[PDB]
């Protein structure tokens, strides 16, 4: 717990900067009475590069709301992102929060930069499905032990509390399996239900996962031919 504390505290300032951007963005949605105050804070400051970034950000936000538009900051924010040796989260979050201000010429080259450095976001996305990968295994196992009821309970449960998620590959798996349960049961809608999502895997060109979901559906259809 100490090492952790130490680690955080060291990087607290950098994290703090993320919070500023977020709150500054919120102010942009509407009220800016304090919106101007952040400038008053970081105008005379204007030392750290990232603190100038914040300043410039608030500037161009405020500016777009007011009648006058100040471009020297717009250019400042521009060159900063253009000249970046290694693209970080901060770089993304900044880029997002001021992309509209930016000239397309920059944006396109910035895009070139950001296209290599998505490596981390991707590997990170996989582990979102470490929860789902587990859920399916359960279902796959429950059907494999012909515990149709158990499997159906899992589904009903995980649709109730994943209800909030609004994730695709989730809603696919639940639908497909809401299918495959109905199909093994012998109800009508289900035979086509499973293929409906299988369309999506083929349509969106996910050959890898399409294969697995398909071959599986065939494999159970096979075993139910015996029925």
């Amino acid at each position: 717990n100490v090492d952790e504390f130490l680690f955080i505290s060291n990087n607290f300032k950098q994290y703090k900067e993320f919070i500023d951007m977020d709150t500054a963005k919120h102010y942009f949605e509407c009220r800016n009475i304090e919106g101007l105050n952040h400038i008053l804070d970081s105008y005379k400051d204007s030392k750290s590069t990232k603190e100038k970034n914040l300043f410039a950000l608030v500037k161009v936000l405020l500016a777009t709301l007011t009648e006058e538009d100040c471009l020297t900051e717009r250019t400042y924010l521009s060159n900063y992102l253009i000249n970046i040796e290694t693209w970080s989260h901060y770089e993304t979050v900044l880029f997002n929060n001021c992309m509209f201000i930016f000239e397309s010429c920059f944006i396109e080259m910035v895009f070139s930069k950001v296209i290599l450095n998505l490596d981390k976001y991707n590997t990170l996305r996989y582990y979102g499905n470490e929860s789902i990968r587990m859920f399916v295994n359960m279902l796959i196992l429950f059907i494999q032990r012909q515990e149709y009821d158990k499997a159906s309970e899992i589904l009903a449960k995980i649709e109730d509390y994943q209800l909030n998620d609004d994730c695709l590959y989730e809603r696919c798996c639940v639908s497909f399996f809401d299918g495959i349960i109905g199909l093994i049961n012998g109800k009508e809608g289900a035979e086509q239900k499973c293929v409906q999502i299988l369309e999506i895997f083929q349509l969106l060109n996910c050959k890898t996962i399409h294969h697995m979901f398909q071959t599986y559906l065939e494999a159970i259809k096979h075993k139910l031919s015996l029925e």
Partner: peptide
Amino acid sequence: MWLLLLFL
């Protein structure tokens, strides 16, 4: 004791 595991 079926011989499977993981898959998707």
